[PDB]
Design a protein around this ligand. Structure first.
Ligand code: A1IML
Ligand code: ZN
Length: 857
């Protein structure tokens, strides 16, 4: 019998209203069984129900109608279409239109050995015992691997979840536990309250031995953090941050959080950073747990931002959800942007607003290529949907919202998002709904925002000044006809007020009130565009940075560094003039422009490390250390100062040590020796630990000692610092061991494999091993992480995007083309191919220019 449905999307005429999910997981055999009951109505007569199911063995399906004495069951025949991830349920007679029915399905499955679906997670107690837990990760399309369902985000429904478990385990889910009942064969059945109407991807449940801590918000919501017993003492920071951030969002959106509780659970094995399941947010342990003695300043910032992101989704994603994955940015761009809006208020000590523009420069790297996609773009299959969780949806999405908020004003933007969330509560939206809500305040936003969401890329704005006359032009910036409504901003030598000008056309002109010495567009880098200055413009701005760099803000200095190097790539500014501009950094003190200088200069030597360019590579590295020497020498070997001062210290000391700057190497060697001689008991300053460990791991004894401490560590920061240091070894047997062991997952968890593979891909001697490992183990890596996942994208780019020869380019094209349906069409593959093509052209054009410039410098 042929399958009676030939589309990837489900039929629109059978709608669920409520699910009752009964799940029994047997953690000793890894088998699980379920009974799903789904209440549906049909709007057109049909005897066939199509729904999603993947890797579930269906034992029986029945169709119920009526209740009590009028209950009429009818058996259903089951057909499956595994490629479409669907099942078809066939009734002996047609369903009556508009009447309620309940589909009852009994099935079994095996706990996934991946990081998605209903999957197995493990950890070892400090006492040595292996413990097994079971957790969920469904977004985007994995709910169908745990229970059969209408697994598309616009088929919202309420869910009543029941879990049968052993008495030794605890179960938690989206809603509060309302009753626990003893059932047959020594099991306990937990009943959770019914959820509000929501998408299937937000269902969650965890069977574990977790401990918890709790705190109640001003609104009466019970917030808890869950973690393994050995790590619950690390939960207080995230618990306090979650309460503050949930209270912030309730007041900000004027819409209370609707559930009685909110849980934040640290899972021992987790693929992404975190997930926003309504009432049960989940995290990597490194994204939630803070050790006041060993955690880094960057990890404190990261936990705060991750918690802010997941809590923003309770409104942007959960309460209001995109209608389909083509508009995933409505969830992700908003949640990413709301991290900065909220944390700027709740944790002013972190000064997170200063870092926001960095996300925009990240998006511009990918968005300058032809392989970029518009923010809103069509997707159909699960691999294509997973590809939407990328820097375009998250970072470009947040950046265009920041640009829109600055254009409309914060208050008008806030009014628009409140109307949007209120109007579409418990429903789904598309792009046009957001523009309609923003326009309902009091400005047409649709034409402008369609230019930023329906076209890939961004514009280059060119400025030409002749006395008081300021000529403006826009063109698509591309490496290798578009038109936007660009909300320009500028300051000048005579006015530090932020001036605004909306450029809606190819060119325009404005007349300054009086002549100026300089003009600087894109103030604070709040706009998603880059700027070129004709004539003496770049000389004026170079002179400004060299003589009075505090004339513009730290973020404005970072924007000039980024844009100067971006203009070299398209032939608008020579590499010599951009390097001449970078010389001002000898007097720079602030983290954002120093880090932006590193973001532009470091990749140049990473390309050289993989070429026969030893002499120029050494000279370029010596130039970089000489450039930042005074700032490096000023660093104290302590944990003193602001979060920015701590992050700047850590990276400068690590950079100096990696490049053999003897004063820093000698000090790191001394700390490592005393730390090792004290059997690793001694508390080192966290901010110098990366440099200390990276130096210490350069000997066989130091590498072995560092690895010996890894198994006992309960600190996510310390484990990450050890992994980084071990990956800097130049012993290829140890590099291959790190790849083999993290791939296996026993001594180093597989959740660390993508980072370890990229770090070894960036090791000056070990980089060929990482690309070789990815090719050899491709099938197993795809099975573990999934085609289209951000993890696979990061592995592809991490192992190949610093190649710069035609031979390496053909290796990449030839390998990925050979995969056919198992990877040849990945967007990350086209992105890395275009990046290598740019690297080839850039090195061919600029290598000798840099060699000559270094000799003159
Ligand atoms: O090069 C890299 C990694 N990396 C790339 O591969 S491309 C890239 C662009 C920017 C940065 C970066 C921005 C800010 C602060 C600090 C770094 C880093 C980076 N790491 C080191 C190295 O392998 O030589 C080793 C550690 C110290 C830094 C240098
Ligand atoms: Zn998100």
């Amino acid at each position: 019998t042929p399958f009676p449905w030939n589309k990837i999307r489900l039929p629109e005429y059978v709608i669920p209203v409520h699910y009752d999910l009964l799940i029994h997981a047997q953690l000793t055999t890894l088998t699980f069984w379920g009974t799903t009951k789904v209440e549906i109505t049909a709007s057109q007569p049909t005897s066939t129900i199509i729904l999603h199911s993947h890797h579930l063995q269906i034992s029986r399906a029945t169709l119920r109608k009526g209740a009590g004495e009028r209950l009429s069951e009818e058996p259903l025949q089951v057909l499956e279409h595994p490629r479409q991830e669907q099942i078809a349920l066939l009734a002996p007679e047609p369903l009556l239109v508009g009447l309620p029915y309940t589909v009852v399905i009994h099935y079994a499955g095996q706990l996934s050995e991946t990081f998605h679906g209903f999957y197995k997670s493990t950890y070892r107690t400090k006492e040595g015992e292996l413990r097994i837990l079971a957790s969920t990760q469904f977004e985007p399309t994995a709910a169908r691997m745990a229970f059969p369902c209408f697994d598309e985000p616009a088929f919202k429904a309420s869910f009543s979840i029941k879990i049968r478990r052993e008495p030794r385990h605890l179960a938690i889910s989206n809603m509060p536990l309302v009753k626990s009942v003893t059932v047959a064969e020594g099991l306990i059945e937990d009943h959770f309250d019914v959820t509000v109407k929501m998408s299937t991807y937000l269902v969650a449940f965890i069977i574990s031995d977790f401990e918890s801590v709790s705190k109640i918000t001003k609104s009466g919501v019970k917030v808890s953090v869950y973690a393994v017993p050995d790590k619950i003492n690390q939960a207080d920071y995230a618990l306090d941050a979650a309460v503050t951030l949930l209270e912030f969002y309730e007041d900000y959106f004027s819409i209370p959080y609707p559930l009685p509780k909110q849980d934040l659970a640290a899972i021992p094995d987790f693929q992404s950073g975190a997930m926003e399941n309504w009432g049960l947010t989940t995290y990597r342990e490194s994204a939630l747990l803070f050790d006041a003695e060993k955690s880094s300043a960057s990890s404190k910032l990261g936990i705060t931002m991750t918690v802010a992101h997941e809590l923003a989704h309770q409104w942007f994603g959960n309460l209001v959800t995109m209608e389909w994955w083509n508009d995933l940015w409505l969830n992700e761009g908003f949640a990413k942007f709301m991290e900065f809006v909220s944390v700027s208020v709740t944790h002013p000590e972190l000064k997170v607003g200063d870092y926001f523009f960095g996300k925009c420069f990240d998006a511009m790297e990918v968005d300058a290529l032809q392989s970029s996609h518009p923010v809103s773009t069509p997707v159909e299959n699960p691999a294509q949907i997973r590809e939407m969780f990328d820097d375009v949806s998250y970072d470009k999405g947040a950046c265009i919202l920041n640009m829109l908020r600055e254009y409309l004003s914060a208050d008008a933007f806030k009014s628009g998002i409140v109307q949007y969330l209120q109007k579409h509560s418990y429903k789904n939206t598309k792009n046009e709904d957001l523009w309609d809500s923003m326009a309902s305040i009091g400005v047409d936003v649709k034409t402008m925002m369609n230019t930023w969401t329906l076209q890939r890329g961004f514009p280059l704005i060119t400025i030409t000044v002749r006395g008081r006359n300021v000529h403006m032009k826009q063109e698509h910036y591309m490496k290798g006809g578009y038109l936007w409504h660009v909300p320009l901003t500028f300051i000048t030598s005579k006015s530090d007020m932020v001036h605004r000008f909306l450029l809606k056309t190819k060119t325009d002109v404005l007349i300054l009130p009086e002549e100026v010495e300089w003009i600087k567009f894109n103030v604070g880098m709040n706009g998603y565009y880059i700027v070129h200055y004709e004539d003496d413009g770049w000389d004026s701005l170079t002179g400004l940075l060299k003589g009075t760099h505090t004339a513009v803000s730290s973020n404005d200095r970072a924007s000039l560094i980024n844009n100067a190097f971006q203009l070299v790539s398209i032939g608008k500014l020579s590499i010599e003039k951009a390097l001449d501009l970078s010389l001002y950094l000898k007097h720079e003190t602030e983290i954002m422009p120093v880090f932006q200088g590193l973001n532009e200069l470091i990749p140049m030597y990473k390309l050289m490390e993989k070429r026969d360019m030893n002499e120029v590579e050494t000279q370029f590295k010596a130039f970089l250390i000489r450039l930042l020497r005074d700032l490096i020498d000023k660093q104290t070997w302590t944990d003193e100062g602001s979060v920015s001062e701590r992050m700047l210290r850590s990276q400068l000391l690590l950079l100096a040590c990696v490049h053999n700057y003897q004063p820093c190497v000698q000090r790191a060697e001394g700390y490592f020796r005393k730390w090792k001689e004290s059997n690793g008991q001694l508390s080192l300053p966290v901010d110098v630990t990366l440099a200390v460990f990276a130096v210490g791991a350069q000997s066989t004894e130091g590498w072995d000692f560092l690895y010996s401490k890894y198994q006992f560590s309960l600190s996510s920061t310390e484990k990450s610092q050890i992994e980084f240091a071990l990956c800097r070894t130049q012993n290829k047997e140890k590099l291959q061991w790190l790849l083999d062991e993290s791939f296996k997952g026993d001594k180093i968890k597989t959740q660390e494999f993508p980072q370890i593979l990229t770090l070894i891909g960036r090791n000056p001697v070990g980089y060929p091993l990482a690309w070789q490992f990815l090719r050899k183990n491709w099938n197993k890596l795809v099975q573990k992480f999934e085609l289209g996942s951000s993890s696979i994208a990061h592995m592809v780019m991490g192992t190949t995007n610093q190649f710069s020869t035609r031979t390496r380019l053909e290796e990449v094209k030839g390998f990925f083309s050979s995969l056919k349906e198992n990877g040849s069409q990945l967007r990350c593959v086209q992105q890395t191919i275009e990046t290598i093509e740019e690297n080839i052209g850039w090195m061919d054009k600029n290598f000798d220019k840099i060699r000559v410039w270094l000799q003159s410098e």
